[PDB]
């Protein structure tokens, strides 16, 4: 399961639903390791929709359990994202993922 630790401020009620394209200032982080991705660097904050399995499974449930302006803290299990395969060269097999997720979106 995805375990959420939201840094408090936001609105707490604009729940993400289907048919909604949302904007996340995410930041990838490997546990017991260094960074591997940061959306703030390119400054194109990754517009994507909900429900078409564009993102991985653990980020999808973590996106749904938030609201506008929040600052979550994901803890993705290996079996939802990459723990069987591992992304070649970037993500090792059987890995545990941490994300700094801020939802500053539309719709």
mmCIF file with all atom_site columns, N, CA, C and O in Angstrom, residues 74-105:
data_model
loop_
_atom_site.group_PDB
_atom_site.id
_atom_site.type_symbol
_atom_site.label_atom_id
_atom_site.label_alt_id
_atom_site.label_comp_id
_atom_site.label_asym_id
_atom_site.label_entity_id
_atom_site.label_seq_id
_atom_site.pdbx_PDB_ins_code
_atom_site.Cartn_x
_atom_site.Cartn_y
_atom_site.Cartn_z
_atom_site.occupancy
_atom_site.B_iso_or_equiv
_atom_site.pdbx_formal_charge
_atom_site.auth_seq_id
_atom_site.auth_comp_id
_atom_site.auth_asym_id
_atom_site.auth_atom_id
_atom_site.pdbx_PDB_model_num
ATOM 1   N N  . UNK A 1 74  ? 5.352  10.235 -0.555  1.00 0.00 ? 74  UNK A N  1
ATOM 2   C CA . UNK A 1 74  ? 5.000  8.876  -0.926  1.00 0.00 ? 74  UNK A CA 1
ATOM 3   C C  . UNK A 1 74  ? 5.959  7.873  -0.303  1.00 0.00 ? 74  UNK A C  1
ATOM 4   O O  . UNK A 1 74  ? 7.044  8.211  0.176   1.00 0.00 ? 74  UNK A O  1
ATOM 5   N N  . UNK A 1 75  ? 5.532  6.614  -0.304  1.00 0.00 ? 75  UNK A N  1
ATOM 6   C CA . UNK A 1 75  ? 6.411  5.493  0.023   1.00 0.00 ? 75  UNK A CA 1
ATOM 7   C C  . UNK A 1 75  ? 5.926  4.327  -0.838  1.00 0.00 ? 75  UNK A C  1
ATOM 8   O O  . UNK A 1 75  ? 5.023  3.583  -0.450  1.00 0.00 ? 75  UNK A O  1
ATOM 9   N N  . UNK A 1 76  ? 6.524  4.190  -2.015  1.00 0.00 ? 76  UNK A N  1
ATOM 10  C CA . UNK A 1 76  ? 6.050  3.232  -3.000  1.00 0.00 ? 76  UNK A CA 1
ATOM 11  C C  . UNK A 1 76  ? 6.698  1.876  -2.763  1.00 0.00 ? 76  UNK A C  1
ATOM 12  O O  . UNK A 1 76  ? 7.915  1.781  -2.584  1.00 0.00 ? 76  UNK A O  1
ATOM 13  N N  . UNK A 1 77  ? 5.877  0.841  -2.752  1.00 0.00 ? 77  UNK A N  1
ATOM 14  C CA . UNK A 1 77  ? 6.345  -0.520 -2.582  1.00 0.00 ? 77  UNK A CA 1
ATOM 15  C C  . UNK A 1 77  ? 7.000  -1.001 -3.877  1.00 0.00 ? 77  UNK A C  1
ATOM 16  O O  . UNK A 1 77  ? 6.764  -0.427 -4.941  1.00 0.00 ? 77  UNK A O  1
ATOM 17  N N  . UNK A 1 78  ? 7.872  -2.020 -3.808  1.00 0.00 ? 78  UNK A N  1
ATOM 18  C CA . UNK A 1 78  ? 8.497  -2.512 -5.050  1.00 0.00 ? 78  UNK A CA 1
ATOM 19  C C  . UNK A 1 78  ? 7.517  -3.140 -6.027  1.00 0.00 ? 78  UNK A C  1
ATOM 20  O O  . UNK A 1 78  ? 7.643  -2.935 -7.240  1.00 0.00 ? 78  UNK A O  1
ATOM 21  N N  . UNK A 1 79  ? 6.511  -3.856 -5.527  1.00 0.00 ? 79  UNK A N  1
ATOM 22  C CA . UNK A 1 79  ? 5.631  -4.631 -6.392  1.00 0.00 ? 79  UNK A CA 1
ATOM 23  C C  . UNK A 1 79  ? 4.628  -3.787 -7.174  1.00 0.00 ? 79  UNK A C  1
ATOM 24  O O  . UNK A 1 79  ? 3.911  -4.342 -8.013  1.00 0.00 ? 79  UNK A O  1
ATOM 25  N N  . UNK A 1 80  ? 4.545  -2.482 -6.926  1.00 0.00 ? 80  UNK A N  1
ATOM 26  C CA . UNK A 1 80  ? 3.649  -1.640 -7.708  1.00 0.00 ? 80  UNK A CA 1
ATOM 27  C C  . UNK A 1 80  ? 4.371  -0.867 -8.806  1.00 0.00 ? 80  UNK A C  1
ATOM 28  O O  . UNK A 1 80  ? 3.726  -0.478 -9.792  1.00 0.00 ? 80  UNK A O  1
ATOM 29  N N  . UNK A 1 81  ? 5.676  -0.626 -8.674  1.00 0.00 ? 81  UNK A N  1
ATOM 30  C CA . UNK A 1 81  ? 6.374  0.217  -9.636  1.00 0.00 ? 81  UNK A CA 1
ATOM 31  C C  . UNK A 1 81  ? 7.460  -0.513 -10.416 1.00 0.00 ? 81  UNK A C  1
ATOM 32  O O  . UNK A 1 81  ? 7.366  -0.607 -11.643 1.00 0.00 ? 81  UNK A O  1
ATOM 33  N N  . UNK A 1 82  ? 8.496  -1.025 -9.750  1.00 0.00 ? 82  UNK A N  1
ATOM 34  C CA . UNK A 1 82  ? 9.636  -1.550 -10.495 1.00 0.00 ? 82  UNK A CA 1
ATOM 35  C C  . UNK A 1 82  ? 10.299 -2.765 -9.858  1.00 0.00 ? 82  UNK A C  1
ATOM 36  O O  . UNK A 1 82  ? 11.366 -3.168 -10.338 1.00 0.00 ? 82  UNK A O  1
ATOM 37  N N  . UNK A 1 83  ? 9.737  -3.349 -8.797  1.00 0.00 ? 83  UNK A N  1
ATOM 38  C CA . UNK A 1 83  ? 10.469 -4.321 -7.999  1.00 0.00 ? 83  UNK A CA 1
ATOM 39  C C  . UNK A 1 83  ? 10.740 -5.640 -8.687  1.00 0.00 ? 83  UNK A C  1
ATOM 40  O O  . UNK A 1 83  ? 11.668 -6.354 -8.291  1.00 0.00 ? 83  UNK A O  1
ATOM 41  N N  . UNK A 1 84  ? 9.960  -5.977 -9.709  1.00 0.00 ? 84  UNK A N  1
ATOM 42  C CA . UNK A 1 84  ? 10.222 -7.197 -10.460 1.00 0.00 ? 84  UNK A CA 1
ATOM 43  C C  . UNK A 1 84  ? 11.287 -6.969 -11.523 1.00 0.00 ? 84  UNK A C  1
ATOM 44  O O  . UNK A 1 84  ? 12.252 -7.735 -11.625 1.00 0.00 ? 84  UNK A O  1
ATOM 45  N N  . UNK A 1 85  ? 11.130 -5.915 -12.320 1.00 0.00 ? 85  UNK A N  1
ATOM 46  C CA . UNK A 1 85  ? 12.032 -5.660 -13.436 1.00 0.00 ? 85  UNK A CA 1
ATOM 47  C C  . UNK A 1 85  ? 13.158 -4.703 -13.057 1.00 0.00 ? 85  UNK A C  1
ATOM 48  O O  . UNK A 1 85  ? 14.336 -5.065 -13.117 1.00 0.00 ? 85  UNK A O  1
ATOM 49  N N  . UNK A 1 86  ? 12.806 -3.484 -12.661 1.00 0.00 ? 86  UNK A N  1
ATOM 50  C CA . UNK A 1 86  ? 13.792 -2.434 -12.500 1.00 0.00 ? 86  UNK A CA 1
ATOM 51  C C  . UNK A 1 86  ? 14.059 -1.758 -13.826 1.00 0.00 ? 86  UNK A C  1
ATOM 52  O O  . UNK A 1 86  ? 14.327 -2.435 -14.823 1.00 0.00 ? 86  UNK A O  1
ATOM 53  N N  . UNK A 1 87  ? 13.979 -0.435 -13.862 1.00 0.00 ? 87  UNK A N  1
ATOM 54  C CA . UNK A 1 87  ? 14.160 0.279  -15.119 1.00 0.00 ? 87  UNK A CA 1
ATOM 55  C C  . UNK A 1 87  ? 15.633 0.251  -15.510 1.00 0.00 ? 87  UNK A C  1
ATOM 56  O O  . UNK A 1 87  ? 16.488 0.586  -14.684 1.00 0.00 ? 87  UNK A O  1
ATOM 57  N N  . UNK A 1 88  ? 15.968 -0.133 -16.759 1.00 0.00 ? 88  UNK A N  1
ATOM 58  C CA . UNK A 1 88  ? 17.355 -0.493 -17.104 1.00 0.00 ? 88  UNK A CA 1
ATOM 59  C C  . UNK A 1 88  ? 18.363 0.642  -17.001 1.00 0.00 ? 88  UNK A C  1
ATOM 60  O O  . UNK A 1 88  ? 18.289 1.635  -17.730 1.00 0.00 ? 88  UNK A O  1
ATOM 61  N N  . UNK A 1 89  ? 19.305 0.496  -16.068 1.00 0.00 ? 89  UNK A N  1
ATOM 62  C CA . UNK A 1 89  ? 20.330 1.478  -15.814 1.00 0.00 ? 89  UNK A CA 1
ATOM 63  C C  . UNK A 1 89  ? 19.939 2.563  -14.831 1.00 0.00 ? 89  UNK A C  1
ATOM 64  O O  . UNK A 1 89  ? 20.807 3.099  -14.137 1.00 0.00 ? 89  UNK A O  1
ATOM 65  N N  . UNK A 1 90  ? 18.655 2.894  -14.754 1.00 0.00 ? 90  UNK A N  1
ATOM 66  C CA . UNK A 1 90  ? 18.191 3.989  -13.910 1.00 0.00 ? 90  UNK A CA 1
ATOM 67  C C  . UNK A 1 90  ? 17.735 3.487  -12.551 1.00 0.00 ? 90  UNK A C  1
ATOM 68  O O  . UNK A 1 90  ? 18.131 4.021  -11.512 1.00 0.00 ? 90  UNK A O  1
ATOM 69  N N  . UNK A 1 91  ? 16.896 2.461  -12.537 1.00 0.00 ? 91  UNK A N  1
ATOM 70  C CA . UNK A 1 91  ? 16.301 1.943  -11.314 1.00 0.00 ? 91  UNK A CA 1
ATOM 71  C C  . UNK A 1 91  ? 16.758 0.502  -11.134 1.00 0.00 ? 91  UNK A C  1
ATOM 72  O O  . UNK A 1 91  ? 16.534 -0.330 -12.017 1.00 0.00 ? 91  UNK A O  1
ATOM 73  N N  . UNK A 1 92  ? 17.383 0.153  -10.018 1.00 0.00 ? 92  UNK A N  1
ATOM 74  C CA . UNK A 1 92  ? 17.784 -1.232 -9.797  1.00 0.00 ? 92  UNK A CA 1
ATOM 75  C C  . UNK A 1 92  ? 16.570 -2.097 -9.516  1.00 0.00 ? 92  UNK A C  1
ATOM 76  O O  . UNK A 1 92  ? 15.514 -1.579 -9.121  1.00 0.00 ? 92  UNK A O  1
ATOM 77  N N  . UNK A 1 93  ? 16.664 -3.403 -9.749  1.00 0.00 ? 93  UNK A N  1
ATOM 78  C CA . UNK A 1 93  ? 15.546 -4.290 -9.410  1.00 0.00 ? 93  UNK A CA 1
ATOM 79  C C  . UNK A 1 93  ? 15.341 -4.374 -7.908  1.00 0.00 ? 93  UNK A C  1
ATOM 80  O O  . UNK A 1 93  ? 16.289 -4.264 -7.126  1.00 0.00 ? 93  UNK A O  1
ATOM 81  N N  . UNK A 1 94  ? 14.069 -4.551 -7.527  1.00 0.00 ? 94  UNK A N  1
ATOM 82  C CA . UNK A 1 94  ? 13.612 -4.683 -6.139  1.00 0.00 ? 94  UNK A CA 1
ATOM 83  C C  . UNK A 1 94  ? 14.000 -3.453 -5.311  1.00 0.00 ? 94  UNK A C  1
ATOM 84  O O  . UNK A 1 94  ? 14.780 -3.523 -4.360  1.00 0.00 ? 94  UNK A O  1
ATOM 85  N N  . UNK A 1 95  ? 13.432 -2.312 -5.699  1.00 0.00 ? 95  UNK A N  1
ATOM 86  C CA . UNK A 1 95  ? 13.769 -1.025 -5.111  1.00 0.00 ? 95  UNK A CA 1
ATOM 87  C C  . UNK A 1 95  ? 12.549 -0.389 -4.457  1.00 0.00 ? 95  UNK A C  1
ATOM 88  O O  . UNK A 1 95  ? 11.405 -0.677 -4.819  1.00 0.00 ? 95  UNK A O  1
ATOM 89  N N  . UNK A 1 96  ? 12.809 0.493  -3.495  1.00 0.00 ? 96  UNK A N  1
ATOM 90  C CA . UNK A 1 96  ? 11.771 1.190  -2.748  1.00 0.00 ? 96  UNK A CA 1
ATOM 91  C C  . UNK A 1 96  ? 11.893 2.682  -3.018  1.00 0.00 ? 96  UNK A C  1
ATOM 92  O O  . UNK A 1 96  ? 12.987 3.246  -2.912  1.00 0.00 ? 96  UNK A O  1
ATOM 93  N N  . UNK A 1 97  ? 10.775 3.320  -3.352  1.00 0.00 ? 97  UNK A N  1
ATOM 94  C CA . UNK A 1 97  ? 10.783 4.651  -3.941  1.00 0.00 ? 97  UNK A CA 1
ATOM 95  C C  . UNK A 1 97  ? 10.168 5.684  -3.006  1.00 0.00 ? 97  UNK A C  1
ATOM 96  O O  . UNK A 1 97  ? 9.181  5.408  -2.316  1.00 0.00 ? 97  UNK A O  1
ATOM 97  N N  . UNK A 1 98  ? 10.756 6.880  -3.006  1.00 0.00 ? 98  UNK A N  1
ATOM 98  C CA . UNK A 1 98  ? 10.313 8.016  -2.206  1.00 0.00 ? 98  UNK A CA 1
ATOM 99  C C  . UNK A 1 98  ? 10.075 9.183  -3.156  1.00 0.00 ? 98  UNK A C  1
ATOM 100 O O  . UNK A 1 98  ? 10.871 9.407  -4.074  1.00 0.00 ? 98  UNK A O  1
ATOM 101 N N  . UNK A 1 99  ? 8.987  9.924  -2.950  1.00 0.00 ? 99  UNK A N  1
ATOM 102 C CA . UNK A 1 99  ? 8.680  11.045 -3.826  1.00 0.00 ? 99  UNK A CA 1
ATOM 103 C C  . UNK A 1 99  ? 8.213  12.255 -3.035  1.00 0.00 ? 99  UNK A C  1
ATOM 104 O O  . UNK A 1 99  ? 7.423  12.131 -2.097  1.00 0.00 ? 99  UNK A O  1
ATOM 105 N N  . UNK A 1 100 ? 8.703  13.426 -3.435  1.00 0.00 ? 100 UNK A N  1
ATOM 106 C CA . UNK A 1 100 ? 8.222  14.706 -2.921  1.00 0.00 ? 100 UNK A CA 1
ATOM 107 C C  . UNK A 1 100 ? 7.187  15.221 -3.911  1.00 0.00 ? 100 UNK A C  1
ATOM 108 O O  . UNK A 1 100 ? 7.531  15.766 -4.961  1.00 0.00 ? 100 UNK A O  1
ATOM 109 N N  . UNK A 1 101 ? 5.914  15.062 -3.566  1.00 0.00 ? 101 UNK A N  1
ATOM 110 C CA . UNK A 1 101 ? 4.806  15.324 -4.475  1.00 0.00 ? 101 UNK A CA 1
ATOM 111 C C  . UNK A 1 101 ? 4.061  16.559 -3.993  1.00 0.00 ? 101 UNK A C  1
ATOM 112 O O  . UNK A 1 101 ? 3.587  16.604 -2.851  1.00 0.00 ? 101 UNK A O  1
ATOM 113 N N  . UNK A 1 102 ? 3.958  17.558 -4.863  1.00 0.00 ? 102 UNK A N  1
ATOM 114 C CA . UNK A 1 102 ? 3.127  18.729 -4.624  1.00 0.00 ? 102 UNK A CA 1
ATOM 115 C C  . UNK A 1 102 ? 2.153  18.865 -5.782  1.00 0.00 ? 102 UNK A C  1
ATOM 116 O O  . UNK A 1 102 ? 2.567  18.920 -6.944  1.00 0.00 ? 102 UNK A O  1
ATOM 117 N N  . UNK A 1 103 ? 0.866  18.915 -5.464  1.00 0.00 ? 103 UNK A N  1
ATOM 118 C CA . UNK A 1 103 ? -0.193 18.952 -6.467  1.00 0.00 ? 103 UNK A CA 1
ATOM 119 C C  . UNK A 1 103 ? -0.682 20.391 -6.597  1.00 0.00 ? 103 UNK A C  1
ATOM 120 O O  . UNK A 1 103 ? -1.459 20.873 -5.769  1.00 0.00 ? 103 UNK A O  1
ATOM 121 N N  . UNK A 1 104 ? -0.217 21.077 -7.635  1.00 0.00 ? 104 UNK A N  1
ATOM 122 C CA . UNK A 1 104 ? -0.642 22.436 -7.961  1.00 0.00 ? 104 UNK A CA 1
ATOM 123 C C  . UNK A 1 104 ? -1.234 22.364 -9.363  1.00 0.00 ? 104 UNK A C  1
ATOM 124 O O  . UNK A 1 104 ? -0.542 22.617 -10.352 1.00 0.00 ? 104 UNK A O  1
ATOM 125 N N  . UNK A 1 105 ? -2.514 22.030 -9.446  1.00 0.00 ? 105 UNK A N  1
ATOM 126 C CA . UNK A 1 105 ? -3.092 21.542 -10.687 1.00 0.00 ? 105 UNK A CA 1
ATOM 127 C C  . UNK A 1 105 ? -4.246 22.418 -11.167 1.00 0.00 ? 105 UNK A C  1
ATOM 128 O O  . UNK A 1 105 ? -4.536 23.481 -10.611 1.00 0.00 ? 105 UNK A O  1
#
